[PDB]
């Protein structure tokens, strides 16, 4: 408990995540208190949605803390994949908010509308603070990208509600709210597509996209090593951001210099950017 | 488009998933049509939630179809991880519904309540059909488990709303609805915990839990092989259900019989259940 805090404040990403989480939780707490005091329902609903949103910041901060943990027997690669998972969760978060935003708008279209504005401007201010803090976001790449996208989705929602309120005050358009809600939901989904693509590619054990184009040249150089007969069972995957794991099997001549072949194969794949490589060498019969 | 359908109907899991998805989509469509016809709002909201829920069945069916695709250059392990992802998404789905259920209940507690019942019984019937179809569910293990948990969450929600409606009709308890909603949300989370644990362990490249206990004995037998000096950089992870990948590096004597050591190491880890194994052999200087 106590020891976790000094670890959080040690890192810049973790410190910023913790401060933003505290800000969001305090805002949601004040919203809940004002809603119960001023017997409001939209206030309570917004506070619950804010707690749900802050759960994603919790996930990002937890991933940032856990990623630095040392590897053990159960987690032989360490806990770096947490970073990827955080991003994948954040994106899913966004997809499960945008749709509901969509839903709400449609309901507000099929229903007589019958404050909730000054609170939205304060949320917009907090989102601007988050954008300023995490501007460089969009292993910590996926955590920062997901958190930045989450704050962007919140900012888009605040802009949408503010625009709807102004447009139906000054000019009295009752159709502005559904269109704005649908548009912001579509924008949220579009913004989240690339992060989800990257996270899903990592989680499906896909070949690292930055390494895929250089792999055939690496295979060709390995085949040109003296005493190599063939390559098989090649697998390259992403452990976390810029950390690539490779496994391959070589068939070599029955008298081949395996020490030299091993060192050459490691050199070839180290120049290609593979951090961790396993080369099995099988001596052929003939 | 057309060719996908014959692939879906070929498999039992895919066929059941497709039929359940069609049933859910038809139910949601009829609910939307009746809501727009009978100018209802709860009907429209329930139809939107049903479409959102059917999105999870879509994810499961898509994972089941894609998992059988052959491996290519980009996806060297194939697409089996989709199964795991489906489960992980399903669980997240559940967590993002239960909480909102929780939220709704609290709102209905802090608000004067002011049909939506006969529809709930029909949804309960459909959920019973799903339970009957997918009883054995709880690579297809994680898909079936996640789909079963999703149908269980829907059944729990239907039971909760039905119980609240009966209890506030016959005996007039206005507090029954919040307690029932909170209880079903807690039950949903508890039910989803183990699937999420298994999926997260797979996605963090954790040591397979069924293989972890036998690994030290395997290491000990490898060290007892003649000419072996040490083991290092061992990694064992789960590709999909019951498919384990291992990588290790051996340091051996400078004159060691590498063919025999390689075959013995493969035998040792094949008896332990490792499907795919990479053994790098480095000859020591001295």
């Amino acid at each position: 408990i106590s020891g976790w805090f000094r670890s959080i404040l040690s890192d810049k990403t973790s410190r910023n995540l913790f401060f933003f989480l505290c800000l969001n939780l305090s805002f949601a707490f004040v919203e809940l208190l004002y809603g119960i005091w001023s017997n409001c329902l939209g206030l309570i609903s917004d506070s619950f949605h804010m707690f749900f949103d802050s759960t994603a910041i919790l996930a990002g901060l937890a991933a940032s803390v856990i990623s630095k943990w040392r590897d053990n027997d159960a987690f032989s690669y360490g806990y770096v994949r947490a970073e990827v998972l955080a991003g994948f969760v954040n994106g899913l978060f966004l997809i499960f908010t945008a749709f509901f935003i969509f839903s709400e708008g449609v309901e507000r279209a099929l229903a007589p509308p019958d404050r909730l504005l000054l609170v939205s401007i304060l949320g917009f201010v907090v989102n601007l603070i988050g954008i300023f803090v995490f501007k460089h976001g969009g292993p910590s790449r996926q955590i920062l990208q997901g958190v930045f996208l989450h704050i962007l989705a919140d900012t888009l929602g605040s802009i949408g509600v503010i625009a709807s309120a102004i447009m139906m005050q000054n000019f009295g358009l009752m159709i502005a709210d559904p269109i704005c809600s649908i548009l912001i939901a579509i924008l949220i989904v579009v913004s989240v597509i690339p992060l989800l693509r990257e996270s899903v590619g990592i989680l499906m054990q896909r070949t690292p996209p930055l390494l895929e184009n250089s792999l055939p040249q690496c295979y060709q150089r390995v085949q040109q090593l003296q005493g190599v007969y063939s390559l098989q069972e090649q697998h390259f995957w992403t452990l976390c951001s810029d950390v690539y794991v490779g496994t391959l099997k070589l068939i070599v001549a029955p008298d081949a210099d395996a020490r030299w072949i091993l060192s050459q194969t490691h050199n070839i794949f180290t120049q290609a950017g593979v951090r961790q490589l396993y080369v099995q060498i099988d001596f052929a019969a003939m | 488009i057309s060719g996908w359908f014959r692939s879906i109907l070929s498999d039992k899991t895919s066929r059941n998933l497709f039929f359940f998805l069609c049933l859910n989509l038809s139910f949601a469509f009829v609910e939307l049509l009746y809501g727009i016809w009978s100018n209802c709002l709860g009907l429209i909201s329930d139809s939107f939630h049903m479409f959102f829920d059917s999105t999870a069945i879509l994810a499961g069916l898509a994972a089941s179809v894609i998992s059988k695709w052959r491996d290519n250059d980009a996806f060297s392990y194939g697409y089996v991880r989709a199964e795991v992802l489906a489960g992980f998404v399903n669980g997240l789905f559940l967590i993002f519904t239960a909480f909102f259920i929780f939220s709704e209940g609290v709102e209905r507690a802090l608000a004067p309540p002011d049909r939506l019942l006969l529809v709930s019984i029909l949804g309960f019937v459909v959920n019973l059909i799903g339970i009957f179809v997918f009883k054995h569910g709880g690579p297809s293990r994680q898909i079936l488990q996640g789909v079963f948990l999703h149908i269980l969450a829907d059944t729990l929600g239907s039971i909760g709303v039905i119980a609240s409606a009966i209890m506030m009709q016959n005996f007039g308890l206005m507090i029954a609805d919040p307690i029932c909603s909170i209880l079903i949300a807690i039950l949903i989370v508890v039910s989803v915990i183990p699937l999420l644990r298994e999926s997260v362990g797979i996605l963090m490249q954790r040591t397979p839990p069924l293989l972890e206990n036998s690994l030290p004995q395997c290491y000990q037998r490898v060290q007892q092989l003649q000419g072996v000096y040490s083991l290092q950089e061992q990694h064992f992870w789960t590709l999909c259900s019951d498919v384990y990948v291992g990588t290790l590096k051996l340091i051996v004597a400078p004159d060691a019989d590498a063919r025999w050591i390689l075959s013995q190491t493969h035998n040792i880890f094949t008896q332990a259940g490792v499907r795919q194994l990479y053994v790098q052999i480095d000859f020591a200087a001295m």
Partner: antibody, heavy 118, light 112 residues
């Protein structure tokens, strides 16, 4: 009693082809690579190529266009063929067995002296 | 290709003394803790004979008076004690990069 013996012409006309046969005893070409190396006073020892047990051949870059190495496992012979022989190719040519699992050569043939002149 | 320079070109050593031959590589011939350098001895009218493989390993059948050392780009072959039959030309060869290349050669003549 591992032995390699080279047989070939002692004189080759310029721009012609040189053919050498290396006969091996005491080991099989089904598990040993055989290197071809030439030695001349002007250039010293020069690695020409290697032929592996499955038939894979690895040549020197400077001779890739005019060199061909083949073999027959049944009669245990390795055939070395060079095209476009100029005067600088005058050298003693050796077939050597590859030292197992190493990049060295452990057994060498006696070598055949080949000179290129009219 | 990797260029090997052998210094000195000729070294004069009396009987029972120590002789040292050096081979210098333009680029490193090492890979993962192994130096892929080999030492050969060639007597007059005889094919080269392998003495050392991988820069420090004594080939089976050669006298224990031959020793090898070095790493990266600096390699040394040492004869102690120097005998009469050691008068020959000693070559260094690298197998780290294709093509295989040999050193210029150092000629050992005996002082008596």
């Amino acid at each position: 009693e591992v032995q390699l013996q080279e047989s070939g012409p002692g004189l080759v006309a310029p721009s012609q082809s040189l053919s050498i046969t290396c006969t091996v005893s005491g080991f099989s070409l089904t598990n040993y690579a055989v290197h071809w190396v030439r030695q001349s006073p002007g250039k010293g020892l020069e690695w020409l190529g290697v032929i592996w047990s499955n038939g894979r051949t690895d040549y020197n870059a400077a001779f890739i266009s005019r060199l061909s190495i083949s073999k027959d496992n049944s009669k245990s012979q390795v055939f070395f063929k060079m095209n476009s022989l100029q005067a600088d190719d005058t050298a003693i040519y050796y077939c050597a067995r590859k030292l197992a699992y190493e990049g060295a050569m452990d057994y060498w043939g006696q070598g055949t002296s080949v000179t290129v002149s009219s | 290709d990797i260029v090997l320079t052998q210094s000195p070109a000729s070294l004069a050593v009396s009987l029972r003394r120590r002789a040292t031959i050096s081979c210098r590589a333009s680029e490193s011939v090492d890979g993962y803790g192994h130096s892929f350098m080999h030492w050969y001895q060639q007597k007059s009218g005889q094919p080269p004979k392998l003495l050392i493989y991988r820069a420090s390993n004594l080939e089976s059948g050669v006298p224990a008076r031959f020793s090898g050392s070095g790493s990266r780009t600096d390699f040394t072959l040492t004869i102690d004690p120097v005998e009469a039959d050691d008068a020959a030309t000693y070559y260094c060869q690298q197998s780290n990069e294709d093509p295989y290349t040999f050193g210029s050669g150092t000629k050992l003549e005996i002082k008596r």
